[PDB]
Every structure is written in structure tokens, then in C-alpha cells.
Amino acid sequence: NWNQGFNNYYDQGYGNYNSAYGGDQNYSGYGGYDYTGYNYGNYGYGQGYAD
Amino acid sequence: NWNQGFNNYYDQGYGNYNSAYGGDQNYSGYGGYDYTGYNYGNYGYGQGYAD
Amino acid sequence: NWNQGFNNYYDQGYGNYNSAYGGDQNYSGYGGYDYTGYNYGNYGYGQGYAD
Amino acid sequence: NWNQGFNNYYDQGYGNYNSAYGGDQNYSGYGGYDYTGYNYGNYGYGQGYAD
Amino acid sequence: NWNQGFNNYYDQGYGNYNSAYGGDQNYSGYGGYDYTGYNYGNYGYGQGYAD
């Protein structure tokens, strides 16, 4: 028995679920508040940043 | 038994589900509030940023 | 019995769940507040930063 | 019996759960506040930083 | 009986849970505040820093 629900959210509270059943879950994004992010990663074929 | 529901949302509360059954789930986006994001990643064939 | 729910969120409180059932969960992103992040990692085939 | 919930969050308090059932959980990201991070790691095939 | 919850967070207090059920949990990231981090580690196949 694995439980992650039965949560109550008020005002501006939120909650996100990133799940992978029978696999591997990879997280590489951004979260939080009052931040600046720059994405240059390579996820397909080639290069992300060319200098 | 895996549970992630039975949640109550009030006012401006929200919740997102990113799931992958029989596979791998990859997260590379942005979340939160009061942030600035720039996306330059390469996801297909070629390059994301050309300098 | 594994429990992670039954949480109450008020005002601007939030909570995220990154889970992987029958697999490995990899975290490489950013979190917190008042930060600046630069992503140059290589996740596919090739190189992330080309100098 | 393993418990990690029944938490109360007020104002801007938050809490994240990175879990891996039947697997290994790897953490290599950033957390906290008032920090600057640079990601150059190699997670796929090739090299992260090319000098 | 293993307990890690029943915590109260006020203002900007937070708490993160990195767990691995039936496996090994590896931590190699950054935490705290007022710090600068550089990631060059190799996590896949190849090399992290090429000089």
C-alpha cells in the first residue's frame, strides 16, 4: 500500500505528480519561485549550444 | 495498490499528473510562479542555439 | 504501508511528487527560490556545450 | 509502517518527494536559495563540456 | 515504526524527502544557501570534462 493523495489545497497551494509505471522517471526541469532559468540541453541528436 | 487521488482543491489550487505507463517519463519544463524561462534545447535533429 | 499524503497546504504552500514504480528515479533539475540556473547537460547523443 | 506525511505548510512553506519504488534514486540537482548553479554533466552518450 | 512526518512549516521553511524503497539512494547534488556550484560529473557513458 503506497499512498500519496488525500491532500487538501487552499488559496494558491498546488501539487504536481510526475510518475512512471514500469520505467524510469527523469527530472531535469525548473521549480520554485523567483528564479531565472536558461535551457540549453541536448535531448535529441546533435548539440545544445553551438559556440 | 498505488493511490494519488482523493484530493480536494479550493480557490486557485491545482494539480497536474504527468504519467507514463510501461515507459519512461522525462520532465524538462518549468514550474512554480514569478519566474522567467528561456528554452533553447534541442529535441529533434540539429542544434538548439546557433551562435 | 508507506504514507506520503494527508498533507494540508495553505496560502502559497506547495508539494511535488516525482515517483518511479519498478524503476530508477533520476533528479538533475533545480529547486528552491531566488536562484539562477544554467542547463548545458547532455541527455541524448552528442555534446551539451561546444567550445 | 513508514510515514512521511501528515505535514502542515503555511505561508510559503513547501515540500518535495523524490521516490523510487523497487529501484535506486539518484539526486544530482540543486536546492536551497540565493545560489547560482551551472550544469555541465554528461547523462547520455558523449561528453558534457568540450574544451 | 519509522516516523519522519508530523512537521509544521511556517514562513519560508521547507523540507524535501529523497527516498528509495528496496534500493540504494545516491545523493550528489547541492544544498544550502549563498553558494555557487559547478557540475561536471559523468553519469552516463563517456567523460564529464574534456581538457
Numbering used by the authors:
A (entry chain D), B (entry chain E), C (entry chain C), D (entry chain B), E (entry chain A): 345 to 395
Quoted passage from the original study:
Human heterogeneous ribonucleoprotein D-like (hnRNPDL) belongs to a class of conserved nuclear RNA-binding proteins (RBPs) that assemble with RNA to form ribonucleoproteins (RNPs). hnRNPDL acts as a transcriptional regulator and participates in the metabolism and biogenesis of mRNA1–4. Three isoforms of hnRNPDL are produced by alternative splicing (AS): hnRNPDL-1, hnRNPDL-2, and hnRNPDL-35. hnRNPDL-2 is a 301 residues protein and the predominant isoform in human tissues. A point mutation in hnRNPDL exon 6 causes autosomal dominant limb-girdle muscular dystrophy D3 (LGMD D3), a rare disease characterized by slowly progressive proximal muscle weakness. Here we present the cryo-electron microscopy (cryo-EM) structure of the fibrils formed by the full-length hnRNPDL-2 isoform at an overall resolution of 2.5 Å.
The fibril consists of a single protofilament where hnRNPDL-2 subunits stack along the fibril (Z) elongation axis. The fibril forms a left-handed helix with a full pitch of ~357 Å, a helical rise of 4.82 Å, and a helical turn of −4.86°, featuring a typical cross-β amyloid structure. A molecular model could be unambiguously built de novo for the fibrils core, spanning hnRNPDL-2 residues 226-276 and matching strikingly the region of exon 6 (residues 224-280), which is absent in the non-amyloidogenic hnRNPDL-3 isoform. The fibril core hosts six individual β-strands (β1 to β6) connected by β-turns and loops, yielding a sort of M-shaped fold, with approximate overall footprint of 55 Å x 40 Å. Accordingly, the filament amino acid composition is skewed towards Gly (27%) and Tyr (25%), which comprise >50% of the residues in the structure, and neutral-polar residues, with Asn, Gln, and Ser summing to 32%. Thus, each layer of the amyloid core is essentially stabilized through intra-subunit hydrogen bonds involving buried polar side chains, main-chain peptide groups, and ordered solvent molecules. Additionally, the Tyr aromatic side chains build ladders of π-π stacking interactions along the fibril elongation direction, stabilizing the inter-subunit association interface. Unlike most amyloid structures, the conformation of hnRNPDL-2 residues N226-D276 outlines pores that define two internal water channels. The major of such channels spans the fibril’s entire length and contains additional densities that correspond to two ordered water molecules per layer, that are H-bonded to nearby polar groups of Y239, N241, and with peptide N-atoms of G256. Apart from D259, the fibril core contains three additional exposed Asp residues, D236, D249, and D276, and no positively charged amino acid, which results in a calculated single-layer pI of 3.3 and a highly anionic patch extended along the fibrillar axis.
